[PDB]
Amino acid sequence: EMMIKKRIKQVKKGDQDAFADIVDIYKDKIYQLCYRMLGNVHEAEDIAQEAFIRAYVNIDSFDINRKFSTWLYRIATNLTIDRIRKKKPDYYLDELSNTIQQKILKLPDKYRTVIVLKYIDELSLIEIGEILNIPVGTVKTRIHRGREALRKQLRDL
Amino acid sequence: CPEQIVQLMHMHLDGDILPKDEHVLNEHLETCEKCRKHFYEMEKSIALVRSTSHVEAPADFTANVMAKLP
């Protein structure tokens, strides 16, 4: 977008106030992604901030050729997948919305991720592919599997 | 329900069915009640998941982000 990229040029030259504009634009969606991935207010908030802080600190390595939201979504996505895995106790050895949230957590994180981006966040199969760094064909598979596991959890609500 | 028509169900939901294969799927639903219940469960689930898209960041989120920058 013209608004956003003009804001990114401004932060890279010193304007930290331009970055707050970027945070304000994406905070809801990024926090939404983290929260629907983790199911936990304190973890989602921590991870969502970490996403933006890391976005700022790595901003001179971002190609303005490419879409900024993809890049930011990818940071947040990697940070949340990271926490879900290290949450598993043995990692280091080698209401209605609320009810659907608990079901979402029972999905393996590869299908959880595509379901959240597709159905809660309304992103295209193309952008998901770029976000996760996989071809559109692979995304479709995971969506199909995710849909299936999701149907098992939700059909009786 | 056979797996071959369940693949068509997913192709409808992806929004890339061929119009030749769109008429194939409708035949199985009305007739095959096992494939009609399966598709109903998926659409019902998709509809409940979409109703969880209301979440906004915490009140002071961007102040807290600005405070943590190097």
Numbering used by the authors:
A (entry chain A): 2 to 95, 125 to 187
B (entry chain C): 3 to 72
Sentences from the paper on this structure:
SigW is one of ECF sigma factors in the gram-positive model bacterium Bacillus subtilis. Its activity is suppressed by the anti-sigma RsiW under normal growth conditions. The cytoplasmic domain (RsiWcyto) interacts tightly with SigW to inhibit SigW activity. In the structure, RsiWcyto interacts with the groove formed along the surface of two domains in SigW (σW2 and σW4), resulting in the burial of the promoter binding area of SigW.
To confirm whether RsiWcyto still binds to SigW in the absence of zinc ions, SigW and RsiWcyto were co-expressed in minimal media that did not contain zinc ions and were co-purified in the absence of a reducing agent and zinc ions to oxidize the zinc coordination motif (SigW/RsiWcytoox). SigW/RsiWcytoox purified in zinc-free oxidation state was crystallized at the same condition as SigW/ RsiWcytoRed/Zn2+, and the structure was determined by molecular replacement using the structure of SigW/RsiWcytoRed/Zn2+ as a template. The final model was refined with R/Rfree values of 23.7/26.8%. Two structures of SigW/RsiWcyto in the zinc-bound and zinc-free states are superposed with an rmsd of 0.8 Å for 223 Cα atoms. This reveals that the absence of zinc ion does not change the overall conformation of SigW/RsiWcyto. The major difference between the two structures resides in the zinc-binding motif. The structure of SigW/RsiWcytoox clearly shows that a disulfide bond is formed between C3 and C37. In addition, H30 and C34 recede from the positions required for zinc coordination. Although there is a slight conformational change induced by the absence of zinc and oxidation, the interaction between SigW and RsiWcyto is not changed. In terms of the binding surface area and the number of bonds between SigW and RsiWcyto, zinc coordination of RsiW does not appear to change its ability to inhibit SigW, suggesting that SigW is not activated by oxidation or the absence of zinc in the CHCC motif of RsiW.
